[PDB]
Amino acid sequence: HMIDIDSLIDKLLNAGFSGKRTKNVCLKNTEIELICASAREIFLSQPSLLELAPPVKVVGDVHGQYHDLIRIFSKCGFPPKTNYLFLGDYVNRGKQSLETILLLLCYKIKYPENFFLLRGNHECANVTRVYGFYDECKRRCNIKTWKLFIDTFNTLPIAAIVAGKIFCVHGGLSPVLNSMDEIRNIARPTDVPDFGLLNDLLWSDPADTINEWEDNERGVSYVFSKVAINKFLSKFNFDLVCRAHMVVEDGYEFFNDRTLVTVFSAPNYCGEFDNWGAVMGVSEDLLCSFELLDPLDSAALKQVMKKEKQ
């Protein structure tokens, strides 16, 4: 029997609109298994480097903040009337990583040509072991379920080009990125390597450094200067680098005279930063606009979920 994607999405949406956290996921592990297999099939069939036509809305980190994800869809439009590109980091830190990733995967399944998910640095075995998702899988489901997600994470595409002009990646640039074909030819499935192209694309950060490339003092990959950005844009004839991978107070933040933008969509990240979330709309004429989401507490979020149910 084939996947009842309508019934799965409904259960997921209902779980979110309840505002309630349950130890049991509203979906059976067999259903979770089917979702991961279906999504995996699509990921491997579509290119490693997505090439998307506008309009589209770009979403940064969500990090398990499921109620905020629903706020995003409510405010920016539900699929498939609104086209989405997510920049990765769907799990860890947040309270409802499972609901979050499952809903995103289901939408990918139902609308494979209008809905897109990139790989973030958190979508790997190493990081999920540390910041909650492995423990959440073990506690709410099992370790076998976790492994299935990792198998699925390993097949995610790495980068996207919007309208031939906006380069989209989770982390940033690489010192060993010679051509777009190198991203296209990243073999999948794959774990995140400790070094190399894929490691850089997920972990690099921009900085106003003196050298084009220096070691990232966050511990992984490199930091790249304004010059590196200007060179990259000029080499591949791009206008904008759109990335995530960093919490910013207003949900978004331009750099190097608006040639790079950081988009972050987890309001009040870690419960500590009190940041806004942002979603970047890219018009058919390549105009970039920003819809913002303010940080709500647990009680206000529940009220918005209560509200949105009608």
Numbering used by the authors: 169 to 478
From the paper:
Here, we describe the structure and function of the first member of a family of protein phosphatases that is specific to fungi, protein phosphatase Z1 (PPZ1) from Candida albicans. Like other fungus-specific phosphatases, C. albicans PPZ1 (484 amino acids [aa], 54.4 kDa) has two domains: an N-terminal intrinsically disordered protein (IDP) domain (aa 1 to 170 [PPZ1Nterm]) and a C-terminal catalytic domain (aa 171 to 484 [PPZ1cat]). PPZ1cat and human PP1α exhibit 66% sequence identity throughout their catalytic domains, and the 6 residues that coordinate the active site metals are 100% conserved. Furthermore, not only is PPZ1 important for cation homeostasis and cell wall biosynthesis, it is also critical for C. albicans virulence.
In order to understand the molecular consequences of the sequence differences between PPZ1 and PP1α and the role of the PPZ1 C-terminal residues in PPZ1 function, we determined the 3-dimensional crystal structure of PPZ1cat to 2.61 Å resolution. The PPZ1cat structure includes residues 171 to 478. As expected, the PPZ1cat structure adopts the canonical PP1 fold, comprising a mixed α/β protein, whose central loops are positioned to coordinate the active site metals. The most significant difference is in the N-terminal region, where the PPZ1cat helix A′ extends for one more turn compared with PP1α and the loop connecting helix A′ to helix A (L1) adopts a conformation distinct from that in PP1α. Although the sequences of L1 between PPZ1cat and PP1α are only 33% identical, this change of conformation is primarily due to a single amino acid change in helix C, Tyr144PP1α to Cys309PPZ1. The much smaller cysteine side chain creates a hydrophobic pocket into which the side chain of Val193PPZ1 binds. The rest of the PPZ1cat L1 conformation changes to accommodate this new interaction, which in turn widens the pocket defined by helix A′, L1, and helix B (referred to here as the “Z1-helix binding pocket”). The newly widened Z1-helix binding pocket results in the second significant structural difference between PPZ1cat and PP1α: the C-terminal residues of PPZ1cat are not disordered like they are in PP1α, but instead form an α-helix that nestles into this newly widened Z1-helix binding pocket. This interaction is stabilized by hydrophobic interactions between the C-terminal helix and residues from helices A′ and B, with the interaction centered on PPZ1 C-terminal helix residue Met473PPZ1. Finally, the experimental B-factors for residues in the Z1-helix are higher than the rest of PPZ1cat, suggesting that the Z1-helix is more dynamic than the rest of the PPZ1cat.
